[PDB]
DNA sequence: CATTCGCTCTGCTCCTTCTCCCATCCTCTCGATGGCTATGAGATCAACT
RNA sequence: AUCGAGAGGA
DNA sequence: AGTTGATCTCATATGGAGAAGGAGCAGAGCGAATG
């Protein structure tokens, strides 16, 4: 029973799904979009990222 | 970009309040001169507000585009929200 | 019972809830009203819809 | 001349391998780490004249 | 002072 | 232009999830050689 706002949830969506294909929110999807390398390194794998 | 047609928001966002209270209250804290009458009032912040609200604050806000344009807008220009 | 889900279930959550911020940190609302990511690709033309 | 045969080249499974990650902040105590003696030759250049 | 371990708080 | 002395420095003795590579292998189809 609990809400959330609709933009929330319209904007995860999209976020996973903007690149054509399904994105994960995990080191396999964030860490392989165009993103720069020092975005890429303060999330997980870093000085493979670097 | 041509200034005739500027297309972004006529409001002042809440961003832009912040930041333009707090750089104003930071030059008059540094002896800037001040553009409205004082009631006595000596904190910097609170005479940034009263310029504020009298349009008086002498700042030019450059809001850049994504594509690198911009357009620029006086706090006179903009309607303020609160 | 609950003490042991109250305690275990907590890295879980708190792995999801980081792994969202990082993959939508830079998502803004532009000065165009076209929600974009530091890429500058447009996720959505308008917030919401 | 219509096969037919043999040989090369994909590309589809099913491993083995391996690399990555695992809430936030704060307090305290406790154990451990914890590195010769000495006499010679001999090169340097700081520094006296 | 560092490193490690353990016990605690929300 | 010639002479001294510290000082350094050698050397002596006694869980799990996804991704990537490889092998197996089936079989398509190409071209040579029939028969």
């Given at each position: 029973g609990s809400y959330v706002?609709?933009?929330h949830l319209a904007l995860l969506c999209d976020t996973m799904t903007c690149r054509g294909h399904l994105m994960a929110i995990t080191r396999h999807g964030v860490n392989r979009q165009?993103?720069?390398?020092?975005?890429?390194?303060?999330?997980?794998?870093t000085v493979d990222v670097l | 970009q041509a200034n005739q047609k500027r297309i972004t928001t006529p409001?002042?966002?809440?961003?832009?309040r912040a930041r333009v209270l707090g750089t104003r209250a930071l030059q008059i804290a540094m002896c800037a001169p001040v553009m409205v009458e004082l009631e006595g009032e000596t904190d910097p912040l609170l005479i940034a507000?009263?310029?504020?609200?009298?349009?008086?604050?002498?700042?030019?806000?450059?809001?850049?585009?994504?594509d690198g344009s911009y357009e620029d807008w006086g706090v006179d220009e903009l309607i303020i929200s609160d | 019972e609950?003490?042991?889900?109250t305690a275990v279930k907590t890295a879980?959550?708190?792995y999801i809830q980081?792994?969202?911020?990082?993959?939508?940190?830079?998502?803004?609302?532009?000065?165009?009203?076209?929600v974009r990511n530091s890429?500058?690709?447009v996720v959505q033309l308008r917030y919401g819809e």
């Open positions: 706002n609709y933009r165009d993103t720069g390398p020092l975005m890429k390194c303060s999330f997980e794998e | 409001y002042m966002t809440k961003y832009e507000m009263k310029e504020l609200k009298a349009r008086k604050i002498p700042i030019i806000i450059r809001r850049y585009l994504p | 609950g003490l042991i889900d879980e959550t708190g980081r792994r969202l911020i990082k993959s939508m940190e830079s998502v803004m609302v532009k000065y165009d009203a076209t890429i500058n690709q």
